[PDB]
């Protein structure tokens, strides 16, 4: 795919949730369907577990490599942490390519 990632013929499947309709007071019969319902919302917890396979580096390069580091000059906040109001801060985009290999 153009955005990035893994292209799959059979992807992890769509998961769908709805609140069941609960009706308001009805005192008479009609063929026409009920349009009056009690107002409701739902809340809960979800857990996702994922397994990943890793490929190890086997480099023979003598000199030291480039690495991602936490490096800031005179910082006024910690990046990837909450602020005084409680809002999360994420200033930098992070890629995967820091290691080097010969062609």
């Amino acid at each position: 795919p153009a955005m990035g990632g893994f292209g799959l013929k059979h992807p992890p499947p769509m998961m769908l949730i709805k609140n069941t309709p609960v009706p308001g007071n009805i005192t008479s019969f009609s063929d026409v369907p009920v349009s009056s319902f009690i107002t409701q919302y739902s809340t809960g917890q979800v857990t996702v577990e994922m397994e990943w396979e890793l490929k190890k580096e086997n480099s023979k390069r003598w000199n030291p490599e480039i690495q991602y580091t936490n490096n800031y000059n005179d910082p006024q906040f910690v990046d990837f942490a909450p602020d005084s109001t409680g809002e999360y801060r994420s200033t930098r985009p992070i890629g995967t390519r820091y290691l080097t290999r010969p062609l």
């Binding site: 480099s59 390069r61 003598w62 000199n63 030291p64 490599e65 690495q67």
Partner: protein, 103 residues
């Protein structure tokens, strides 16, 4: 064994296996005949203004092998891999071989 047969082979390598790392280092050395086969008494009086400089001693015909430096066993890339990923390290075992002698 013989004039035409090699005593040993070159090994320079690092192997990483979970909690253990093994380092192999090979070098070529030269030995001078020091003191012309004799033992000499050596001594000093005060020098650069200091009596702490004064000593009495012996110089010898022999030479010695020293490996007490980290760069002797570690590549700069291998040292970066250890400092980045581990809380601590300690030494466990040492093996030494001397071979391919030429007078």
């Amino acid at each position: 064994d013989g004039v035409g047969n090699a005593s040993g082979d070159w090994h320079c390598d690092s192997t990483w296996m979970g909690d253990r790392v093994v380092t192999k280092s090979t070098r070529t050395w030269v030995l001078p005949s020091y003191n012309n086969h004799q033992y000499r008494e050596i001594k000093s009086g005060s020098v650069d203004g200091s009596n702490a400089n004064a000593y009495f001693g012996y110089s010898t015909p022999w030479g010695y092998f020293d490996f007490n430096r980290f760069h002797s066993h570690w590549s700069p890339r291998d040292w970066q891999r250890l400092i980045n990923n581990y809380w601590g390290f300690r030494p466990r075992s040492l093996r030494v071989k001397i071979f391919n002698i030429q007078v």
